[PDB]
Design a protein around this ligand. Structure first.
Ligand SMILES: COc1ccccc1C1CCN(c2nc(C3(F)CC3)nc3ccc(N(C)CCO)cc23)CC1
Lengths: 6, 298
């Protein structure tokens, strides 16, 4: 997983 | 299907919602009344307006879709870009307003005559308008970056759309590095140096004078003048370091513990980021008694 919320 | 979700606790959601609501109710009134109260006055009003715009624009959408337990975005492709563009514009506006206010106070305290000579009222209005326009111009890049994407593995899930950067990671990384450099580092250095030299000037005032309240007034003035730098650094460093951590870290370093810690640090950093919009009127009242009286009367 890679977070998407900047 | 569930690879796109965030697992922060619902209790955390409610708690951070309460904190956000408290900050919103405090800050909206705090900035609005001072803006109504109204060449340092123009800079103070511009800073209050920028803080109010930040709190009005970033808070609701962020709390709804970003700061919550739910992943799926609902502002449409145009909204994905618009929210971030307004947020960036407001952030730059706040930083530049703080830096300009520090510069104006430096000029007024240290070089009074030429300060009015070069910073007339019309000149001040033009300068603040130019600062706002520059802040808007620096936030343009976020428009074509922060789009929507069907990140779901199937590509057509019920919540595939998410507001995430679309450009290749290198350009996102470089633009956010530029954002950190121009929104934090430069205003940080300007504010720190100017406030420190002004505080030294007030300290030499105190040393030479040595009055019932004059010494007390100067001491509290320097205290607040350095607390401004302290608050700016404390509130703004976590946000920019979170963005840099989002951009810079490699795929192999990511782990579920890191993912969840990042989504907690999001809430922490955004709370600290919003604290800035509410702190300002408190210090405005703490520093000036006449301003406090007019603020209370209004
Ligand atoms: C460096 O000033 C900054 C930078 C960033 C954010 C907030 C401030 C405030 C510091 C306190 N304050 C004032 N500071 C000073 C000093 F810089 C210590 C001399 N003299 C004032 C004189 C009047 C005044 N008003 C509230 C105007 C009311 O009509 C505020 C200040 C307003 C700016």
């Amino acid at each position: 997983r890679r977070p998407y919320i900047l | 299907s569930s690879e796109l979700d965030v697992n922060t606790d619902i209790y955390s959601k409610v708690l951070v919602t309460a904190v956000y609501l408290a900050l919103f109710v405090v800050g909206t009134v705090g900035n609005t009344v001072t803006a109504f109260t109204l060449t340092v006055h123009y800079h103070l009003g511009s800073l209050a307006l920028s803080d109010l715009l930040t709190l009005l624009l970033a808070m609701p959408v962020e709390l709804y879709n970003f700061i919550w337990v739910h992943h799926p975005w609902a502002f449409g492709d145009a909204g994905c870009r618009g929210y971030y563009f307004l947020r960036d514009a407001c952030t730059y506006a706040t930083a530049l307003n703080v830096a300009s206010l520090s510069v104006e106070r430096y000029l007024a305290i240290c070089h009074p005559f030429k300060a009015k000579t070069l910073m007339s009222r019309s000149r001040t209005k033009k300068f603040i308008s130019a600062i706002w326009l520059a802040s808007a111009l620096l936030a343009v890049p976020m428009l074509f970056t922060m789009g929507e994407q069907n990140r779901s593995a199937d590509g057509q899930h019920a919540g595939g759309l998410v507001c995430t950067p679309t450009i290749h990671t290198a350009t996102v990384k470089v633009v956010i590095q530029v954002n950190t450099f121009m929104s934090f580092i430069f205003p940080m250095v300007v504010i720190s140096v100017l406030n420190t030299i002004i505080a030294n000037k007030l300290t030499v005032m105190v040393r030479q004078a040595a009055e019932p309240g004059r010494v007390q007034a100067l001491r509290h003035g320097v205290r607040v003048l350095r607390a401004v730098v302290i608050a700016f650094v404390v509130c703004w460093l976590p946000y920019h370091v979170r963005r840099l951590m989002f951009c810079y870290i490699s795929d192999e370093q990511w782990t579920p513990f890191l993912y969840d810690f990042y989504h907690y640090f999001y809430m922490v950093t955004n709370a600290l980021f919003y604290v800035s919009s509410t702190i300002n009127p408190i210090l405005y009242n703490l520093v000036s008694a006449n301003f406090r009286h007019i603020f209370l009367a209004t």
